[PDB]
Subunit: 386 residues, 4 copies
């Protein structure tokens, strides 16, 4: 039952199953994973491919020699499995040099360094087949109000992403960028804290068509926002280039639970949206097997990410396919929602007396929305109780 | 001390000092205010002007006759005081007809009604001198996931705001629009939940130059976001057409405390930003005197809004003017933040070996940001302890 | 399927299905319900009984005459249905007189009034069969720090509940009290904000055995707390006298969605706990049919409360009954958790060298908890995917 | 100005100024501190003393030999400075062995190990002068609902703290225990998540008089609770044995900013309470100099903790001492709050017709609380604007 296959486009970061378990209050509980072993174990679980930070694949400060061997091993692992690399990203957060950010560090030389580090990995990403290069500004932010002039920092961020856009256009690369928003942690407040903020920022960039969002379930939920809604806005904008899936129990530290845990109902409405909107990008899991687990639990947890998506996909598909649900949708006027409000135009609307002077407001007010019955149908389907 | 004057551009909604105290669990504790009395009492407190929902000024369902007398009284009150009306807005939330929204109700006739109601008040707003017409989609949203197709709802919202833009362009009006974001309440999740989401949405509108944001201190804080940061992003985008000021104690129901209460430090960093960025629009207070107060407390609470802004303005101005602070700002490299990261261009950056190959990363990493000393200087100033 | 029967002990407040839909930003969308009609419609849905605030049953300021007719009608409705009244409570929040609280108002005469109002309804509750009298201090609190001396207010609250305890002991009543915690709303912060705070407070009361908690799913979740955990602590303390069930989507205004909505997984772990711990009190639904609904949706929403509990009860029972789950429970050492840590006593523990000097820490550290596999089994069961 | 002296009873954990800056997404930015250097630098800043986890002072797995030298060096540093050690605690969270908790690990041998580790450090704490031994159950909890039977875990926690109580009674030690609550992180939900929960739990212990709370500003605020209120409840209960001070910006990861940052107004109301209630225990700072800082910033940040307390203490003292404030307090009936509600007893209250039958409810309802004017006086004082 619910066995993932490569056509489900499930991908995992190297840093996910590879997470060693060091948290703010704790030492590592698992040994470091050879990226080659992760490629194989993930392929045996049915995954479509893998993603990486530069520093996951090539340890920081590697010689050109050692860099080459690390890439070669990895490429060989991709060969014998067919594993794809749809996305890659830069580690602009771990090293002490980035303690005040990468692209928006107050120190200018750190900003130039960040760009060179990113540009080097773009090349590697493009060679491996990456279609999206993700930017997560984990360190772009502040704990205190005087430490960052946010308008100047937005200048520096626009200038960085404008340079990366100019670079990929000069190389004729096909790769596109996706900003991964996060509201906070490890900075007190992170710039571009939500999907909305990243989407707005992209529109001031020089080549906005090159940039989209990589939203993460848990990150929007850390601001208490509705992740299915934010995704619909990203899709509405045409900017859902990529997506990070995982679990989060409300507003607290970034948990990165396996997808399906955390807000289960939101997970259902999310899968329902991706599937019914025809999202065709990677279903990427940016999660962490809890440090309570050993390696067996790491792989069970990763298997759980895909299984929960597949179960949810089946419940949503049956929900939409149900005639009582289709009848409930009309009863709640979801079909009227898709109708243009005034396709007769402004002037016709201004003269329409049934739109104001003769609008029976109390009759329209007394029409129940029948939202609760529709939602119990969704609940019944989610729980298999139909 | 700290006495507000009209040049401080402090404005209040009729619905603020006029709030009667009915909350979800409680009946009203104060009698309804005559809008004329509010105009006068606010002018006697030093306010610049007032704002209104249509339904604050003209009770719902008024005859053309009674509408005229309500407007005439109001206009006379503005005459004898000089009170301005910089902003007006539509009540698309109180009446039962809007229980599923205005511009994005599933019922199409309610959507057309909402537009006619808005368009009627636009005319009145323009006649009274309003420069901004605010849209707050309080009812645009859902409590459950199946009740609203968010992409279709975004279609309906874009079509509504496109029609309002077409209307004001046809009348040659000067007024501009400002979306007032709110993440939730009274809907479980409200569309365009934050400043970011509203800014992004505006860029898909047909005449984006006509639309900006009216951010509210408390609303961004209900998503746990940094209001001074979101404001800097709005200013960076050129979209801070208007601003709502008040207090909020973290993530919970919309409190609308008087400005200064709630997150005091955020209030300081906010005033510091508006003043140093040269914001020149209204300092509008969308707050509610707590229902524990009588009319004396209503007016003391409103006076508190302006007083706290003025005290904070003086502390921030002294903070910036302090030489130790200017020295602390350089010590934290805030001046380096304003410098272009790579004004020598992409190619020069690619060949700069001091940007990567010869970048001493450990030396840059060991340079402390001196952020804590700068913040204690800000704290010392805020508390008058210098 | 999943049809509730009186033996399921489902109860509803009069104020739940009877909620008219007035919220902070909105007028009522439904007409007021005759309490008699609610008793009948709820009995036809399979409910065990009803609960009430005094002011739900007898309108405020009723003559002794009119009070009598309202009680008589109600008692007749209970007769022809067999509906029980397991719990009643006082409205110490709606009337303007309680704007600063009931038992902890700063005004002493309001405090004495609150007690008389409560004591009058205790009598009525006891006559109707109530076993629990619930106290919700909705108005006990403050928006600002100087407005309430919290230690003095705790004195006044202890003195109130001590008087109610002295009253029920003098009348020889069997009824017991249950404090219903809420962290905020409509006050900025409410005293005894969580289950923990109420449990602690009870231990300083004069007859602690008379007092327990009435925890509400949504209220603990408004503080971001784990409701199943808090319930286990209440059960552990022997104080789960009663329970309020409903849905809440994280930290925001009190939503009071129907049980099952909001945090579905928490709902599952809750039902799993009540059932496996043998809770035998009322399954009380303190929810609100969203104001988008008409009367048909009110009753569908109420039916949804019971249906979701019953579905969840079946999933949890099957989860516990599953041999793979019982094997997973042992694999995660849940059975070792029930074992006394040192039943050999302090001295034996002090001399046990396998407890410290010869404890192989790295071997114990390398034993995975197998928590993820256990949780996917729970997920599989919840979703019917076994 | 505002220079701390030992009589201010300011203490710091070794792990605070000693925090190296490793966070979930980042490597350390500062070198490890010699505990001896920290004792001296803190004494030069005016601190009263220091606190430690066992593993801060003696590195894990130290020989009896090396343990002795580490303790000897430390004791010598305390000698030449006069620095006190008022509190010590056990590290039951860092080592991988504690990944599922200490006292409530599912593995029984880990639970016995935890107790032996705690008991060993109790001895050392008592020898150094510690009056409070703090328990922080950082790892007591779960990420998923099936992983922890919370009632069994409460059994194991009561049995652990009962054994520690039996141990200190057998040795005739004077030291008392203080539970340090935290709602979450690093576990998804931590047992005894708030002050309320810990206070309640203490009352089921065998010798409750030996146990109090060590509340942390930021931890209650991570549940969105009012820290000054929770402290008043702890004081009301007689259980404020100790207190952790720091800053937190709302509901998010545990920030541990320096005291004064985060919720400044709450900091003011906190100092106002500790001082006016006559708290005489340590003012302990459990904070972390942000990893952006070098060693100069570490010490400036620590100096900021004490300075902000001292500034706030002066503002609160002047607030209380102000005659307009004392007049405002009476105007808001804070003096009536301290009066017994019904010292005439139950029967007199039952017969008092001015308490119900002849209570003019509308007159009492129309008396404003004058809370806003009182709060602006507090604000004016806090900002030095009087
Ligand atoms: O940089 C991209 C990735 O970095 C990871 O370390 C973080 O956990 C993710 O939030 C992000 O997707
Ligand atoms: O519609 C504009 C205004 O409506 C008011 O009722 C709400 O309180 C505000 O959020 C908003 O500024
Ligand atoms: O007073 C008891 C009840 O009052 C109701 O109005 C509130 O909604 C509930 O929180 C509470 O259970
Ligand atoms: O164990 C006591 C201390 O441990 C520290 O590591 C944590 O940061 C604190 O929350 C706690 O006060
Ligand atoms: Mg991510
Ligand atoms: Mg507003
Ligand atoms: Mg309730
Ligand atoms: Mg602590
Ligand atoms: Mn994450
Ligand atoms: Mn608001
Ligand atoms: Mn509720
Ligand atoms: Mn902390």
């Amino acid at each position: 039952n619910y066995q993932p296959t490569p056509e489900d486009r499930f991908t995992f970061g190297l840093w996910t199953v590879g997470w060693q378990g060091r948290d703010p209050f704790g030492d590592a509980t698992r040994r470091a994973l050879d990226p080659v072993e992760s490629v194989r174990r993930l392929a045996e679980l049915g995954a479509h491919g893998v993603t990486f930070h530069d520093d996951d694949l090539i340890p920081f400060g590697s010689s050109d020699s050692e860099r080459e061997e690390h890439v070669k091993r990895f490429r060989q692992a991709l060969d014998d499995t067919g594993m794809k690399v749809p996305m890659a990203t830069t580690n602009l957060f771990t090293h002490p040099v980035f303690k005040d950010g990468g692209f928006t560090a107050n120190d200018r030389d750190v900003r130039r360094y960040a760009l060179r580090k990113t540009i080097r990995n773009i090349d590697l990403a493009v060679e491996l087949g990456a279609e999206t290069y993700v930017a997560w500004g984990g360190r772009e932010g502040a704990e205190s109000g005087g430490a960052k002039d946010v308008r100047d920092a937005l200048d520096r961020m626009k200038e960085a992403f404008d340079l990366l856009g100019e670079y990929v256009t000069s190389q004729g690369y096909d790769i596109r960028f996706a900003i991964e928003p996060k509201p906070n942690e490890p900075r007190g407040d992170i710039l571009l804290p939500t999907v909305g903020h990243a989407l707005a920022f992209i529109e001031r960039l020089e080549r906005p068509e090159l940039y989209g969002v990589n939203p993460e379930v848990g990150h929007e939920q850390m601001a208490g926002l509705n992740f299915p809604h934010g995704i619909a806005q990203a899709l509405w904008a045409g900017k859902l280039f990529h997506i990070d899936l995982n679990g989060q129990n409300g507003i607290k530290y970034d948990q990165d639970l396996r997808f399906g845990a955390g807000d289960l109902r939101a997970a259902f409405w999310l899968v329902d949206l991706l599937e019914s909107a025809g999202y065709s990008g990677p279903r990427h899991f940016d999660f962490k097997p809890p440090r309570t687990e050993d390696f067996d639990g790491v792989w069970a947890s990763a298997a759980g990410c895909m299984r929960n998506y597949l179960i949810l996909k089946e419940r949503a598909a049956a929900f939409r396919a149900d005639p009582e649900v289709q009848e409930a949708l009309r009863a709640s006027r979801l079909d009227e929602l898709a109708r243009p409000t005034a396709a007769d135009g402004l002037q016709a609307l201004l003269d329409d007396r049934s739109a104001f002077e003769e609008f029976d407001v109390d009759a329209a007010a007394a029409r129940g929305m029948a939202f609760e019955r529709l939602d119990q149908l969704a609940m019944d389907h989610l729980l298999g109780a139909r």
